Write a protein that binds this DNA or RNA. Structure first.
Ligand SMILES: [Zn+2]
Ligand SMILES: [Zn+2]
Ligand SMILES: [Zn+2]
Ligand SMILES: [Zn+2]
Ligand SMILES: [Zn+2]
Lengths: 76, 74
DNA sequence: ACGCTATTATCGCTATTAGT
DNA sequence: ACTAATAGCGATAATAGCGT
């Protein structure tokens, strides 16, 4: 089944299965438990979000390859 | 039987005091001279957010190094 | 330093919204 | 309808961190 809804609570509160006061930047829930730096809200749908991560992973992966290449050239 | 993982830093637990929980290192064990030995345990409901935080920080540093190397190569 | 129980977070389970 | 996603309550397992 398709997921068109964009959750209003933060990702962590969702995972922890507890009510999110949904304050921004970070919710009190996360600030309280000390994970405010991990608190964030979804802006796109599950699917758009999945794609985005795939792109970022590939970008990340290729950059590591490139850097290795350059470092290897700076001492060949 | 649940899987409750402690939230404060390893030391404060060990000592049994209240952890201000500040990140990356709490004031509790910054006052006692061990700041950079202060770390927290990984919560399962934080793996993903955590993994995503490394990825971002790393994509960030790699872009700074690629430029730094591209120059040092001339 | 730590024993010890008041404080506090987990996740089975109830409701409810919404894809087909 | 049927029931996959969501929201998240709350009994209570367990950590939290106070006070000896
Ligand atoms: Zn939240
Ligand atoms: Zn949050
Ligand atoms: Zn601490
Ligand atoms: Zn440090
Ligand atoms: Zn600490």
């Amino acid at each position: 089944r398709k997921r068109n809804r964009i959750p209003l609570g933060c990702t962590i509160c969702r995972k922890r299965k507890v009510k999110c006061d949904k304050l921004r930047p970070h919710c009190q829930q996360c600030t309280k438990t000390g994970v405010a730096h991990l608190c964030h809200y979804m802006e796109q749908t599950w699917a758009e979000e999945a794609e985005k991560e795939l792109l970022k992973d590939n970008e990340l992966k290729k950059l590591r390859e490139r850097v290795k290449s350059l470092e290897k050239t700076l001492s060949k």
